[PDB]
């Protein structure tokens, strides 16, 4: 069923024809207790 669903149609074939170890604290601020995290 997965293979039937995800078979490539012809048009897609025709069209066809940075890592670094960061930390969560470095990018995103911590959230105060009792508050919904938002990002």
């Amino acid at each position: 069923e997965l293979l039937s669903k995800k078979k490539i149609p012809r048009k897609l074939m025709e069209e066809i024809s940075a890592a670094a170890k960061l930390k969560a604290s470095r990018l995103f601020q911590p959230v105060q207790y009792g508050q919904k995290p938002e990002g």
Partner: protein, 67 residues
């Protein structure tokens, strides 16, 4: 035997590192409070959170005399 007190980090700090680092504590204040059970209006002091400043004293609800 002694009472069991709750605490995190009993299973080690390392395993609970991410949870503690994800959050930050709310601010507490040494603040004066009005006790409406008192008739004089004297202000004593509390350790309370900042958002709770100025809220009605909860222990004042106990105050009611025998008729």
């Amino acid at each position: 035997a002694p009472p069991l007190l709750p605490s995190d980090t009993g299973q080690g700090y390392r395993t609970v590192k991410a949870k503690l680092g994800s959050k930050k504590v709310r601010p507490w204040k040494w603040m004066p409070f009005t006790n409406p059970a008192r008739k004089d209006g004297a202000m004593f002091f509390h350790w309370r959170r900042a958002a709770e400043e100025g809220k009605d004293y909860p222990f004042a609800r106990f105050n009611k005399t025998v008729q």
